Each structure stands twice: as structure tokens, then as C-alpha cells.
């Protein structure tokens, strides 16, 4: 044995143009190169990428968001490259002061540039969500990916859009910066009296560390029974082999309760989406309904 992590030998054939089904063609670019570097881990083929209407709209809106922030970083950096790199972590795009509040009459140098970048981010992410749904339906596939992404959109909409509207201003929200969105996260817990008492914060970790436990254990399983070809996880669903029989038993013999091949993925998708599902609820209620989770813990209501 060799603990099947990397690959000893690399094989390669003609470029894989993928399946068709109802996927509009043409759009797939010419296949990219083959990177041997990645082939030791996973596949070596890059592309072909599909770029549609929402695809271009998304990539365009995202680069607009990327640049609108970076332009501001140069203004602070006196247009000097040396101080750009030095203070790079410290520049920040803060939202309008509370004196404004929802109103879009904030000057550029005092919050107006936030809403510009926020509008690009808002449309680029949802353009990508629409993209993750149309690629699922185009291949006549389940749409499980589009709903899991909605869970991550949930926390993101709560942080920057759902909660600022409920609070009554954008003075809240999140500023675009490296070291500054770290200080924001610190402050949020401080102002609300240790998010640790927030029961949904505590439930978010339990699922954040699910995800660490589950995917550490599941990846180790398939590698442990790769020797029976357990990586081919769909044909084992449609026709159980020993790779799945040994998989169910080791889980049974070690902790009692059992798991199947399709079953363990049902565990997997929820243990992940529950992180941001409970997270968005605990951040949305924070400040809107509960002012201080500590005191809430003292009364339970």
C-alpha cells in the first residue's frame, strides 16, 4: 500500500469536451492546457469553461467591484506603489456614516463609493447564483448546488443588506478591507456582549466543526477503500460493492450507527449549509431583537 494520496503514474488522452445533453454548445471555450502539477492530486485538464449571458454579466460586475475597491486603495496610498504594498492590509472602504442612513446621497469620499461597489457585488453574486442553477438544469441534473449556495448567500445578505435595512442605516454593514473586516467582527461581538452566548453562533461552530470532522472522516474513508474502487461513488449507489459494504461496517463497528453511500452525502450537504443557515439567523437577530446576548442568556427571553 501507499496511502493513495498522490498518483504514481499519470495517463492522458484527447481533451474531454464533456457531455452535451441540453447544454448550448459553442459557448464552451477552447480547452485550456493540461497541468501535470495538478494531475498528481486531481485531474490535469483545464477548461473548457462555459461563459453565457449571466457568466459575462457576473464576471464584469465582479471586476467592477474588485476595481472600485482597489481604486480607493490608490487614493489613500497617494497613488504611490511603495505605500500601496506596505499598507495594503490596512486600506478600507467604509459605508456611509449614520448621519446618512439608507439614503444614497452619500458623497463619494464619505460612503457613496461603498454603495457603488456594493451594487456590483450584489449583482455579480446573484448573477453567479443564476449561473449555478442553469448549469444544473442544462445537464438534466439535480439542483442541489443552487440551494446550498443560497445558504452562503443568506449569511452574506444578512451581513450587508438584510440587517442594515432593518437597523435603519448602512452605518452598519461591512467595510471592504483585509484588516478592517477583522476589526469589524471583533466589534460586533463586543457591542452585543459576547456572541458566544448567542445560541446560533454556538450552533454555527458545531456545524463548522461537523464539516471539519465529517469531511476529514469521509475523505479518509474513500481513500481507505479506494483499493476497491470506492471513489466511483455513484455506481456504488446503483449497485453496492464491497467498497461501500466495508464503509458502512467500519462506521457501524466503531460507533454503532450506520451510513450508506448516498446517505453519507445527505449528512454532508446539511452539515455544511447549516453553518450559514444558523449563522444568518444569529446575526440577523443580533441588534434587531437582542441587544446583548449575555443578558438574554440570563433571562432566556
Amino acid at each position: 500500500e501507499y496511502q493513495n494520496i498522490f498518483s504514481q503514474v499519470q495517463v492522458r488522452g484527447p481533451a474531454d469536451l464533456g457531455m452535451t445533453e441540453d447544454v448550448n454548445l459553442a459557448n464552451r471555450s477552447g480547452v485550456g492546457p493540461f497541468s501535470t502539477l495538478l494531475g498528481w492530486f486531481g485531474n490535469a485538464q483545464l477548461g473548457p469553461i462555459y461563459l453565457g449571458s449571466l457568466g459575462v454579466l457576473s464576471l464584469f460586475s465582479g471586476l467592477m467591484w474588485f476595481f472600485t475597491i482597489g481604486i480607493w486603495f490608490w487614493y489613500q496610498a497617494g497613488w504611490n506603489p511603495a505605500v500601496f504594498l506596505r499598507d495594503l492590509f490596512f486600506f478600507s472602504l467604509e459605508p456611509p456614516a449614520p448621519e446618512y442612513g439608507l439614503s444614497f446621497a452619500a458623497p463619494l469620499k464619505e460612503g457613496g463609493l461603498w454603495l457603488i461597489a456594493s451594487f456590483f457585488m450584489f449583482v455579480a453574486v446573484w448573477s453567479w447564483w443564476g449561473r449555478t442553477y442553469l448549469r444544473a438544469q442544462a445537464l438534466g441534473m439535480g439542483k442541489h448546488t443552487a440551494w446550498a449556495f443560497l445558504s452562503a448567500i443568506w449569511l452574506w445578505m444578512v451581513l450587508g443588506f438584510i440587517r442594515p435595512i432593518l437597523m435603519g442605516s448602512w452605518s452598519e454593514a461591512v467595510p471592504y478591507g483585509i484588516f478592517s473586516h477583522l476589526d469589524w467582527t471583533n466589534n460586533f461581538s463586543l457591542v452585543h456582549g459576547n456572541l458566544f452566548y448567542n445560541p446560533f453562533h454556538g450552533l454555527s461552530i458545531a456545524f463548522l466543526x461537523g464539516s471539519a470532522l465529517l469531511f476529514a472522516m469521509h475523505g479518509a474513508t474513500i481513500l481507505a477503500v479506494s483499493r476497491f474502487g470506492g471513489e466511483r461513488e455513484l455506481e456504488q449507489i446503483a449497485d453496492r460493492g464491497t467498497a461501500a459494504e466495508r464503509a458502512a461496517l467500519f462506521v457501524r463497528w466503531t460507533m454503532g450507527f450506520n451510513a450508506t453511500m448516498e446517505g453519507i452525502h445527505r449528512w454532508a450537504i446539511w452539515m455544511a449549509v447549516l453553518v450559514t443557515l444558523t449563522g444568518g439567523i444569529g446575526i440577523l437577530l443580533s441588534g434587531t431583537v437582542v441587544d446583548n446576548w449575555y443578558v438574554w442568556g440570563q433571562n432566556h427571553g
Binding site: 503514474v9 488522452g13 483499493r227 449528512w267 427571553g301
Partner: protein, 240 residues
């Protein structure tokens, strides 16, 4: 208050979620049985799920689970005690009878096909345009059993065409026949290929596939079961 409602109504949603999940992991393997094969008394505290039906692609029928479970192969073991939960010793050669770590499953004696209909695993030289991209090229090297004796030489690489990766080592033994070696079971070395699981006299016992251009699901399991099972039941020889 409102937050107490959200934290309570969610602690209920989770309780129904754990229910739903734990019943979906009952499709295969249930109903539980005693060691003698008859259905057990208590079968867990969770009911069985409403039967779901898969539409197998390429028109290979439909698997519906949870379905009637039968081994479809004779298991050659015997009790070692009079109480439950004790091991069962085999009554023959576990690697030929296929028990313990050398167990296989009676999957369809058909090959897995790609989304286009053709065989997923073809020998390289049947595979148009395929070759070795990087790393050592095991074709040509002598596969040696781990008892430091040599039992054959690699005369091909059985590759996976959709996922482009080597899956088997077509190993030809001294009598001219060829076996298949699970690739996660050999160590491709600079001047040899080294197989931890087996010794020399055991390569000829590896199950033989029928059509020399394709290996089927049932055939794959008797091979990978054999080789993988040889770790425990081999031990006849080999050290370093």
C-alpha cells in the same frame, strides 16, 4: 420572545432533520438479521423508509431501494461460540471462498460505462490517444510479490477514459496468463513494481476475467477483494 422562538423552532427542525437523515441511511443493509440469517427481533428504533426507485441510465433496468437483500453467493463460515457477536471462522480458504478482508459482492457481471455508453475501463492499447504523461511508466517492469520473488511483469495499464487515471496493472505471469492488479495496491518503483498484499504463489490465484478487453463490476470485486484480502491471510511470507 422572538429569539427564543427562533432557537426553539430550530431545535425542532433539527430533530426532524436527524430523523429524516437517519432513516435514509437504512436503504441498504436493512432489515437486520441474526447470525443465522433470519430477521432480527428489534430492528433499531427507526422505521424503514418509503422505497425510492433509481432510473439506471443506458436502460439497465431500475434499482429500487430498500429492496430485497440477498447475498446471492454462498458464504463459507461457521460459528465459533454459542452466543451472538462472536467471530465466524472460515471452513476453507478465505481468499478462494471470499470471506473476511477477501470478501466480494455479487454486483452486476457487467462493466461500468461512461455517460456516452462505452466502457469506462479499457486497456491502454484499445484506448485511442492515451499514454503516460508523467511519473514512472509501469509497463515493462517486473511485478514482484513481496516475498521478494518475482511473479510477472506489467504488460499494460488498464486506464479510466472519462477520469483519465490508471486503475489496473495488466500483469502477465510466468505461464503466459494475465491478471489485473488494483493500482492502489502496487508501489511503482524505479526498477520494479512492488505489491504488498500478495506473495508470488498467490498471483496465479487472482481471479481471471473473461473478455480481455473489459472487466465487469462483479469481476472487479473478486480481484480487489482477493488482493486486498491477501494482507491478512497472506502473511505466509515477505518482510521488507
Amino acid at each position: 420572545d422572538l429569539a427564543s422562538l427562533a432557537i426553539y423552532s430550530f431545535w425542532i427542525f433539527l430533530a426532524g432533520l436527524i430523523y429524516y437523515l437517519q432513516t435514509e441511511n437504512m436503504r441498504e443493509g436493512y432489515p437486520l438479521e441474526n447470525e443465522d440469517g433470519t430477521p432480527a427481533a428489534n430492528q433499531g428504533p427507526f422505521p424503514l423508509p418509503k422505497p425510492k426507485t433509481f432510473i439506471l441510465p443506458h436502460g439497465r433496468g431500475t434499482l429500487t431501494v430498500p429492496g430485497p437483500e440477498s447475498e446471492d453467493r454462498p458464504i463459507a463460515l461457521a460459528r465459533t461460540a454459542v452466543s451472538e457477536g462472536f467471530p465466524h471462522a472460515p471452513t476453507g480458504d478465505p481468499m478462494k471462498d471470499g470471506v473476511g478482508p477477501a470478501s466480494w459482492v455479487a454486483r452486476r457481471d457487467l462493466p461500468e460505462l461512461d455517460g456516452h455508453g462505452h466502457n469506462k475501463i479499457k486497456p491502454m492499447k484499445a484506448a485511442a490517444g492515451f499514454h503516460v504523461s508523467a511519473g514512472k511508466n509501469p509497463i515493462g517492469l517486473p511485478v514482484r510479490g513481496c516475498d521478494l520473488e518475482i511473479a510477472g511483469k506489467v504488460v499494460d495499464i488498464w486506464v479510466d477514459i472519462p477520469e483519465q487515471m490508471a486503475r489496473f496493472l495488466e500483469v502477465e505471469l510466468k505461464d503466459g496468463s494475465t491478471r489485473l492488479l488494483p493500482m492502489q495496491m502496487v508501489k511503482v518503483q524505479s526498477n520494479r513494481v512492488h505489491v504488498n498484499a500478495l506473495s508470488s504463489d498467490l498471483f496465479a490465484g487472482i481471479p481471471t476475467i473473461k473478455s480481455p478487453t473489459e472487466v465487469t463490476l462483479l469481476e472487479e470485486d473478486k480481484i480487489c477483494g482477493y488482493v486486498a484480502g491477501g494482507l491478512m491471510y497472506a502473511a505466509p511470507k515477505r518482510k521488507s
